Amino acid sequence: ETGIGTLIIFIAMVLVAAVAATVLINTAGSLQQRATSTGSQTTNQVSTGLIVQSIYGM
Amino acid sequence: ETGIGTLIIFIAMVLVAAVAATVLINTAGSLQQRATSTGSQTTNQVSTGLIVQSIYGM
């Protein structure tokens, strides 16, 4: 009967959907750390600087 | 059926969207404190100064 064949494919459908879910989570986690670090590094880059007061010679 | 697979990926889609939301909030909060402090420090920097009145010798 059709009942047996339906159950077999059902298991396969669940496993496939889990794979595509894993890709999206892993990619978002990788891009999270890069975007956070870039923002913090740029903030330090703009604000920091050195200034010359006076120059003397002998 | 397609109904089972749709629900599994749906959960994953919601979790991924939450991650990207967290990045934007955290970055804006970090840049908030830097921009506020820079403005206040510069205002004090320009306004403050010392002046010499008179010099006497013995």
Residue numbers in the entry:
A (entry chain A), B (entry chain D): 25 to 82
From the reporting publication:
Archaeal Type IV pilins and archaellins, which form the subunits of pili and archaella, respectively, are expressed as preproteins with a signal peptide. The pilins/archaellins are then assembled into a filament, wherein the hydrophobic alpha helical N-termini are helically stacked in the core of the filament, and the hydrophilic β-strand-rich heads are oriented towards the filament's periphery. Through single particle cryo-electron microscopy (cryoEM) and helical reconstruction, we solved the structures of these filaments at 2.61 and 2.52 Å resolution for C. divulgatum and O. meridianum, respectively. Atomic model building, bioinformatics analysis, and motility experiments suggest that the C. divulgatum fibre is a nonrotary, likely adhesive T4P, whereas the O. meridianum filament is an archaellum.
The ArlB of O. meridianum is largely a typical archaellin, consisting of an N-terminal α-helical tail and a globular head domain. The O. meridianum pre-archaellin ArlB has a length of 254 AA, of which the 26 most N-terminal residues form the leader peptide. The O. meridianum archaellum filament has an unusual, barbed structure distinct from previously investigated archaella, which tend to have a rather smooth surface. The barbs are formed by a unique extended loop that is flanked by two short ⍺-helices and spans from V126 to L153. In the assembled filament, these spikes give the archaellum a barbed surface profile. Oxyplasma meridianum ArlB boasts eight glycans (N62, N72, N91, N113, N121, N138, N150, N187), making it the most heavily glycosylated archaeal filament protein known to date. Nine N-glycosylation sequons are present in total; however, N206 faces inside the β-sheet head and thus is likely inaccessible to posttranslational modification. Only two of the eight glycans are bound to the spike domain, suggesting that it has not evolved to serve as a dedicated glycosylation sub-domain, as seen in the archaellum of S. acidocaldarius. In contrast, a typical hinge region for archaella consists of two residues, and the archaellum of O. meridianum follows this general trend. We observed that O. meridianum is capable of directional swimming motion, thus confirming that the archaella of this organism are indeed functional.
